[PDB]
Design a protein around this ligand. Structure first.
Ligand SMILES: NC(=O)C1=CN([C@@H]2O[C@H](COP(=O)(O)OP(=O)(O)OC[C@H]3O[C@@H](n4cnc5c(N)ncnc54)[C@H](OP(=O)(O)O)[C@@H]3O)[C@@H](O)[C@H]2O)C=CC1
Ligand SMILES: NC(=O)C1=CN([C@@H]2O[C@H](COP(=O)(O)OP(=O)(O)OC[C@H]3O[C@@H](n4cnc5c(N)ncnc54)[C@H](OP(=O)(O)O)[C@@H]3O)[C@@H](O)[C@H]2O)C=CC1
Ligand SMILES: CCc1nc(N)nc(N)c1OCCCOc1ccccc1CCC(=O)O
Ligand SMILES: CCc1nc(N)nc(N)c1OCCCOc1ccccc1CCC(=O)O
Lengths: 544, 545
C-alpha cells in the first residue's frame, strides 16, 4: 500500500508568491525565510499588475508533455486502479475563484484539460471539454478515466490548503516574486520536514522586479557514447581516498540540490571547490589557508544586483570607499571619521613600520587606488598635498573613451603601478578593470590577484557591480555583465566552519540597485544616491 | 534492415599506433595526416618498451562492462539468431603472434574472455583458459554461444586487416602515440569514406611521449528531474535568434564530433562561439571584427606543449621575441636582423608618425614590453641608451619572490605602464602575468586585454607557455598550468573563411618542449636552448583572402 496517490497520478502544485507588507509593526531587523514569499492574491485578483516571465514559465510548465515517457505512467496508473483524441496533454486543476478571476480570452487554458473545483458550478452551462468536480476525491476518480501526462494544481488559497493536508502533492513549482504587494490570500506555510527544495533557477528581472523559480520535493521520509564517456574518464582521481578534511554530511543540503542555477552558486561552488581541492599553504599572516589559482564569475547586472543572500552584507562602508577612490584620496582618516574602518589596520604605525614606511604618517596609505586612478605617475609626497592636474587621470580618460570611442580595446583602469608599489600601505588586490561597450551596454572585467573568499570577495563583487553601474550611468549606457577574474583564491582555515554553514543555505532572489538618476558625472555621487531594494537574506555570520 | 554482424555482436577494434621510421626523408617540410600514426609492432613485439597510460586505458576499455545494459544486448542477439527470451565479461580476440608477444604473467588477460586465432596451434598447445578458433566464421559462431558484453579485436596487423575487410568493426579505439619507433607491421590505412573520427581525448604524457585517444566510427556509407531541466530552460533563445549568418554545413566535421576533449578545442570553441554569437563592431583598423568579452583557456604544461596543430606554426620568431623581451630591448632592428618581422609594421616612419611619435627613430618602439619588464618607471630616451639599474626590474623581482617567498600573492609582472602608454609604438596586448607556486610546481595566469583570435592568440599561447617553462626552470620548479584570460576577443572578418577551414580539422596530439637543463639564469637563454619535438600538424593557413 506504499503505492502513493500523488505519485500514481503525478499531481504537482505550481504557484507564484510575492512578499506581503510586514504589517507596519514587525520587531527588529526583519527576519527572512521561505515563508517570506507567500502572497497569492488580493481581492479575487493577482496582487501585481503583470509579470510576463512567470506567465511564460507557468504556461510552458503546465502545457509541456513528453509522449515517449507516458506509456510508463499509464502503465503505472492502470496497474493501480486495476484497469481517443491523442494529443497527450496535462490536467490543470483550479478553484472557482481562481477560474473566475482568469481573463476571458484565456479560457479554456490552451492545450490543457481544464478542471474546476466548485460546490455550486454545474457541468451543463459548461462544455464537456471543461470538467467540473464535487470535492477533492472526485478528482482522483476523473484521472483514472483520463489520458493526461501530469496534473497541475493551479490553485487558490483553499485548493492549496486542502491538497497539502491531504498529502496529494508530489512537487511544488514555486515562483518567488521579490517585491511587496498587499494581498488578502496567502500560500500555506510549507513544513520543511515535509517538503524540501531540490532546485533553484537563475535569477531574472521582469516588469521591474526580480524573481526566480524553485522546486519543492516531497521528502522521502544510442549509448555506445554513454560508454565512450566512461572510457575517457579512465584516469580520474577520487577513490575518495578523500583530500582535505571535509566530511559528506557536512554539505548535505548543498549536495542534495539537483539544479543550482542561482548566480550565487558561482561564488558558493568556488568555496566548495577550494574546500574540496584546495592546497594547504602557510601564509604571510600565519593562519593557514586553502588556495587554488584561477576562477571566473559572471553576473548579469541587467537582471539583478548580486548582493550575496546566504548571509547578511552591509554596503555603506564599501560605497564610501568607492567614493573615496573616485575623489582620488589616500587619507585613511577621511574614512575613519565616517566609521568606515576597512583600511584602519593598513594604516597603523605598526603596519606601516612593518612595511618599512617609517616616515609615513599613520593612516597615510601612500599612492594607492585613488591616487593611481586620478594621478598615475605623479610623485607622491603626503596625503595632504595638492595633486590637482598631476599625473594621468585614468578615470577621466576611460569615461571619455567610453563616450567617444566605445569600441576601443584600451578602456582600462589600472591600480597596479609597479613603480609605486612599495610606497603603498599594501599593493592593490584589485589589479585592473577593463570595460567593453556594445549596443548601448557596458560590461566590466576586474582582475583580482588575491581573494579572501570568506570575507573579502562578497564585498568585492558588490563594489565593482556598483562601480559598473556608476560608470554606465554617467556614460548613458545600461550595465550588462560584471566579470570577476580571481587569481590566488583562498579560504582561511578559521573561516571553514562558517562557510560550511553558509553553503547549506539556499539563495533568495537577488535585490536590485537603484542610483539617483540625476547624477550625470562620475564625481557627483554621494552616499544618499544609492539604494538597495528588496534585499532578502539569511542571518548574519561572523566568519571567524 | 539487414542488421549487420558487428552491431549485433558489438565487435570493436582497439589499437595503439606510433609514427613510423622513414628517417631523414624531408623532416623539415614533411606532410602529416591520420596515416602518420600507423606503427603497431616490430620483431614480433611492441615498437616501444612501455607506455603505461595506454596500458591502463587499453585495460579499462577492454574489461569494462555495464551489467544493466546486457539484458537488452542479450535480446538483440537472441532475436537475431532467432533464439529466445559468473561475472559478466568482455570477449577479446588476438592473432597468434599477438598472443605470443604478451608476457606470460599477463596471460590470460585478466577479467576478459580470451580468444586466439590460429591455424598452426590447437587447444592442446595452450595451458591457459582460452578459446582457440581457426576461422573468423568460428568467432561469430562462438559469440553466438557465449554470454559477454562487448567483443574487442586486439589484433596483429593480420587480424586488424581481415576484420576491417569483412566490415566486422563497429568502432576503432585508436591511440595516437606521438613518437617515432622502428616498426615492421602496420595498422591498415583507414578509409575516410568508411570510418570517421567522432571523438578525441585530452592529451597526456607517459614514459616520455605525448599521446591521445580517438574513436573512429563506421559511417553509414530518476527521470522527473529530466523534465525540470526542460522547465528551467524555458527562456532559452529561438533557433533563428542566434546572431550571425553562419551556416550549418560550414562546420559539418567540427559539429559531427561527439567528444572534443583535446585541449586545442578551448581555442577552436572560442572561435566558433565568436562566429556564432560575436558582436559586429568596427575597429581601429577598418576591417571590422566579430567580438566578445571575456574567455579563459587552461593548458597543462606538464602533459604537453600547447602549440596548435590545426595549422602550422613556427616558433623561432616568438622565441627570439621572448629573449628580446627578457633582455629589455626596444630596438626593432635587432629582430629584423634575425629575420623576425613580428614588430616591423609597428616601427615604420608612417606608423610612428600616425602615433604622433614624430621624434622617434624608425624601429625605435619606445618603452614597450621589454623595457617595462626590466626598467618600469625609468625615463625612456631612445633604444640605444644604457638603462642599467634604472626603473624597477620586475623580472628579477618575480624570480626572487618565486624562490624565496613562493606563497606570495604578489608575484605579478605588468607591462601596462599607464604613464608610458603614448610613448609606446602601441599599448601592450598581454597586460600582466601572475605566478602561483605549490608543491614544487609553477602555474601562470596571463591577462590579455585585446586578442586577435585568428593570428595573435595561437602565438601568445605558445609564448607564455615557453616563458612559464623558463621561469619554472631557473627557479627549480616544474611547470604546471598556463591559464590564459582573454578580455576583448575578436576575429577579423577577413579571417573568417580561413578559420572556417581550421575548425573542421581534427587536432593531433601536442608536441613537447625541451629546454637546455644547464641554463639556470633567466637571462642566459639562447635560441638553441629550445627544441620542439614531435610537432605533428595540419597545413599552413593564410588567414588572409
Ligand atoms: N499566485 C498564484 O500562483 C495563484 C493565485 N491565485 C489567486 O488566488 C485567489 C483565489 O484564491 P481563493 O479565494 O482561495 O480561491 P480558490 O481558487 O481556492 O477557489 C475556492 C473556491 O473553490 C471551491 N472549493 C474549495 N474547496 C473545495 C472543495 N473541497 N470541493 C469543491 N469545491 C471547493 C469553492 O466554490 P464554491 O463556493 O462554488 O463551493 C470555493 O469558494 C485569486 O485572487 C487568484 O488570482 C490563484 C491561483 C494561483
Ligand atoms: N600496437 C598495438 O596496439 C598492437 C600491436 N601488435 C603487434 O603486432 C605484431 C603482430 O601482428 P601480426 O604479425 O600481424 O600478427 P597477428 O597478431 O595478427 O597474428 C597473425 C597470426 O594469427 C593467426 N590468424 C590471423 N587470422 C586468422 C584466421 N582468420 N584464421 C586462423 N588464424 C588466423 C595466424 O596464426 P598461425 O600463424 O599460428 O596460424 C596468423 O599468422 C606484434 O609485433 C605485436 O606486438 C599486436 C596487437 C596490438
Ligand atoms: C499568476 C500565474 C501563475 N504563475 C504560477 N507560477 N503559478 C500559478 N499557479 C499561476 O496562476 C495560474 C492561475 C491563473 O492563470 C492566469 C491568470 C491571468 C491571466 C492568465 C492566466 C493563465 C494563462 C495561460 O495558462 O495561458
Ligand atoms: C600496446 C597495448 C595496446 N594498446 C591498445 N590501445 N590497443 C591494443 N590493442 C594493445 O595491445 C593489446 C595487445 C597485447 O597486450 C599487451 C602487450 C604487452 C604487455 C601487456 C599487454 C596487455 C595486458 C593486459 O591487458 O592486462
Amino acid at each position: 500500500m506504499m503505492e502513493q496517490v500523488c505519485d500514481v497520478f503525478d499531481i504537482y502544485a505550481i504557484c507564484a508568491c510575492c512578499k506581503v507588507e510586514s504589517k507596519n509593526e514587525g520587531k527588529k531587523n526583519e527576519v527572512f525565510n521561505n515563508y517570506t514569499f507567500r502572497g497569492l492574491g488580493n481581492k479575487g485578483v493577482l496582487p501585481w499588475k503583470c509579470i510576463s516571465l512567470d506567465m511564460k514559465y507557468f504556461r510552458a510548465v503546465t502545457t509541456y508533455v513528453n509522449e515517449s515517457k507516458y506509456e510508463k505512467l499509464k502503465y503505472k496508473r492502470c496497474k493501480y486502479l486495476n484497469k481517443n483524441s491523442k494529443k497527450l496533454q496535462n490536467v490543470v486543476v483550479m478553484g472557482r475563484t481562481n477560474w473566475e478571476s482568469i481573463p476571458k480570452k484565456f479560457k479554456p487554458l490552451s492545450n490543457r484539460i481544464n478542471v474546476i473545483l466548485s460546490r455550486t458550478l454545474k457541468k451543463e452551462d459548461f462544455d464537456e471539454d471543461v470538467y467540473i468536480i464535487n470535492k477533492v476525491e472526485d478528482l482522483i476518480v476523473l484521472l483514472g478515466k483520463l489520458n493526461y501526462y501530469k496534473c497541475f494544481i493551479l490553485g487558490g488559497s483553499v485548493v492549496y490548503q486542502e491538497f497539502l493536508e491531504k498529502k496529494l502533492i508530489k512537487k511544488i513549482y514555486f515562483t518567488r516574486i521579490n517585491s511587496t504587494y498587499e494581498c488578502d490570500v496567502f500560500f500555506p506555510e510549507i513544513n520543511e520536514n515535509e517538503y524540501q527544495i531540490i532546485s533553484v533557477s537563475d535569477v531574472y528581472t521582469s516588469n521591474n522586479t526580480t524573481l526566480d523559480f524553485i522546486i519543492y520535493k516531497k521528502t522521502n521520509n544510442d549509448d555506445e557514447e554513454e560508454d565512450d564517456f566512461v572510457y575517457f574518464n579512465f584516469n580520474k582521481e577520487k577513490e575518495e581516498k578523500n583530500k582535505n578534511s571535509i566530511h559528506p554530511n557536512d554539505f548535505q543540503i548543498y549536495n542534495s540540490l539537483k539544479y543550482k542555477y542561482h548566480p550565487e552558486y558561482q561564488y558558493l561552488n568556488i568555496i566548495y571547490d577550494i574546500m574540496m581541492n584546495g592546497n594547504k599553504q602557510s601564509d604571510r599572516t600565519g593562519v593557514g589557508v586553502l588556495s587554488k589559482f584561477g576562477y571566473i564569475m559572471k553576473f548579469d547586472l541587467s537582471q539583478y544586483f548580486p548582493l550575496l543572500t546566504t548571509k547578511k552584507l552591509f554596503l555603506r562602508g564599501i560605497i564610501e570607499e568607492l567614493l573615496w577612490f573616485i575623489r582620488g584620496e589616500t587619507n585613511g582618516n577621511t574614512l575613519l571619521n565616517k566609521n568606515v574602518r576597512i583600511w584602519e589596520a593598513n594604516g597603523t604605525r605598526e603596519f606601516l613600520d612593518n612595511r618599512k614606511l617609517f616616515h609615513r604618517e599613520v593612516n597615510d596609505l601612500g599612492p594607492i587606488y585613488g591616487f593611481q586612478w586620478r594621478h598615475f605617475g605623479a610623485e607622491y609626497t603626503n596625503m595632504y598635498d595638492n595633486y590637482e592636474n598631476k599625473g594621468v587621470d585614468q578615470l577621466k580618460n576611460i569615461i571619455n573613451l567610453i563616450k567617444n570611442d566605445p569600441t576601443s580595446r584600451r578602456i582600462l583602469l589600472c591600480a597596479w603601478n609597479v613603480k609605486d608599489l612599495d610606497q603603498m600601505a599594501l599593493p592593490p588586490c584589485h589589479i585592473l578593470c577593463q570595460f567593453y561597450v556594445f549596443d548601448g551596454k557596458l560590461s566590466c572585467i576586474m582582475y583580482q590577484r588575491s581573494c579572501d573568499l570568506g570575507l573579502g570577495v562578497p564585498f568585492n563583487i558588490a563594489s565593482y557591480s556598483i562601480f559598473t553601474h556608476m560608470i554606465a550611468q554617467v556614460c548613458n549606457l545600461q550595465p550588462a555583465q560584471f566579470i570577476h577574474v580571481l587569481g590566488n583564491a583562498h579560504v582561511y582555515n578559521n573561516h571553514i566552519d562558517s562557510l560550511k554553514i553558509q553553503l547549506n543555505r539556499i539563495p533568495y532572489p537577488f535585490p536590485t540597485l537603484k542610483l539617483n538618476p540625476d547624477i550625470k558625472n562620475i564625481e557627483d555621487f554621494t552616499i544618499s544616491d544609492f539604494t538597495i531594494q528588496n534585499y532578502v537574506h539569511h542571518e548574519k555570520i561572523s566568519m571567524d
